[PDB]
Ligand binder design. Structure first.
Ligand SMILES: *C(=O)[C@@H](NC(=O)Cc1ccccc1)[C@@H]1N[C@@H](C(=O)O)C(C)(C)S1
Ligand SMILES: [Cl-]
Ligand SMILES: [Cl-]
Length: 418
């Protein structure tokens, strides 16, 4: 039986079969014609699609080829058939978006998740660096394989499913929670002097620090300037109960119906912060938050659905599933409108991607890990609400920011997905 195909949303192949003339024990391509598993996108979708391998003795313990990793293994039952050819599985992936999202990294460690925010379609799930899935499935030498395993940037890992601290992009949720709680007034002008702030001397040598000097600061200025002090103060103003009440309406601790293994997102290590510092850190995306890029794109989907959360989906014919009224419609549109300044204001961090013919909201972020720094970029299509991007660059202190590489992807999406 011929193994079933994995195709993208347009029917283009992602995991298919192709006949080669191999130079009987086939080694490499030239003598005998054999059918081999082929991946047209190669490393661009290696971690997602995975690769196949020969059935081993340990596999036959839980009663041809079998999917070893990725969707080849998760869908191995439906794909392998029975010798009835295997079934064809059509994904939400867009091959053009998948290849563009992978090209921007250029061996930099990071990930990119592009979604249809109103339907949950995962248009692209990219992890960098990557590996050749055709060689892993049909013949890789110990030299090339050891180069993958000794790569400290870990190309085999699926970074879009790994949990990270979200960074300053998380301020969009903290601000929306503050709006619905009634403690955050969008027009209130907060006096903030200097670059560091603590509640009082009980914080010791720790301060919430910002990068830009500005006063007074309202909600929109705090988002565009990415002011940590404003959001640390607003988080302490609302309190842990009001803060967690809004956070708990998101998908924290919730396993998703995605064929991708993923630890659920968490707010902190325990049910209580037991620290004003930890409560304030969580307000601007640090602390003990662990959210994967797929989970981040899911949480941030509320700003393009009038406060409704749209769950992600990878299989095209799967019905859209939502979580209603995670935040209010007024809070979602207030935050999304304020994020237009990140792209449209000449001093905004995403002004490099400014397009006078397209409405793009955005929010950047740099997380400090116990150190190293990761860069994040969230963009929101506000012209038609047809795409959402969650882009991350690991070790941004050496690899640069996500904003510095993501413009060709955003330009591609504004002309294609629109
Ligand atoms: C949000 O993530 C904020 N980041 C920090 O407070 C930590 C940090 C890391 C490196 C340098 C300075 C501060 C602010 N948002 C990011 C961002 O948008 O890239 C800033 C670096 C502007 S700070
Ligand atoms: Cl799915
Ligand atoms: Cl920003």
């Amino acid at each position: 039986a011929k193994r079933g195909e994995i195709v993208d949303r347009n029917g283009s192949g992602l995991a298919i079969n192709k006949v080669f003339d191999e130079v009987f024990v086939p080694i490499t391509v030239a003598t005998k014609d054999t059918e081999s598993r082929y991946y047209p996108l190669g490393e661009a979708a290696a971690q997602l699609i995975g690769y196949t391998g020969t059935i081993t003795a340990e596999d036959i313990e839980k009663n041809g080829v079998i999917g070893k990793t990725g969707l080849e293994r998760a869908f191995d039952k439906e794909l392998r058939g029975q010798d009835k050819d295997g079934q064809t599985i059509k994904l939400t992936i867009d091959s053009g978006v998948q290849q563009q999202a992978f090209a921007i990294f250029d061996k930099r460690p990071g990930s990119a998740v592009i979604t249809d925010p109103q339907k949950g379609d995962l248009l692209a799930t990219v992890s960098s660096p990557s590996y050749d899935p055709n060689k892993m499935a049909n013949g890789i030498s110990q030299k090339e394989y050891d180069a993958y395993n000794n790569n400290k940037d870990l190309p085999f890992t699926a970074r879009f499913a790994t949990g990270y601290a979200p960074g300053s992009t998380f301020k969009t949720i903290t601000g929306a929670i503050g709006l619905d709680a009634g403690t955050l007034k969008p027009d209130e002008e907060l006096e903030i002097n200097g670059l560091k702030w603590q509640k009082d001397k009980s914080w010791g040598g720790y301060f919430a620090t910002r990068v830009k000097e500005a006063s007074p600061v309202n909600l929109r200025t705090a988002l565009v300037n990415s002011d940590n002090i404003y959001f640390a103060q607003q988080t302490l103003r609302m309190g842990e109960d009001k803060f967690r009440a809004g956070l708990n309406k998101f998908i924290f601790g919730e396993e998703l119906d995605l064929p991708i293994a993923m630890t659920p997102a968490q707010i902190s290590n325990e049910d209580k912060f037991n620290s004003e510092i930890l409560l304030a850190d969580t307000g601007y995306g640090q602390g003990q938050l662990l959210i994967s890029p797929i989970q981040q794109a899911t949480m941030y989907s509320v700003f393009q659905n009038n406060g409704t959360l749209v769950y992600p989906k990878l299989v095209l014919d799967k019905e859209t599933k939502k979580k209603d009224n995670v935040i209010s419609a007024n809070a979602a549109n207030t935050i999304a409108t304020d994020l237009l300044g990140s792209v449209e204001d000449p001093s905004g961090y995403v002004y490099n991607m400014y397009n006078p013919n397209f409405s793009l909201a955005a929010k950047t972020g740099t997380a400090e890990i116990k150190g190293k720094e990761n860069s994040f970029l969230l963009t929101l299509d506000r012209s038609n609400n047809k795409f959402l991007t969650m882009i991350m660059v690991e070790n941004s202190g050496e690899n640069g920011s996500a904003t510095d590489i993501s413009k060709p992807l955003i330009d591609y999406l504004e002309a294609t997905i629109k």
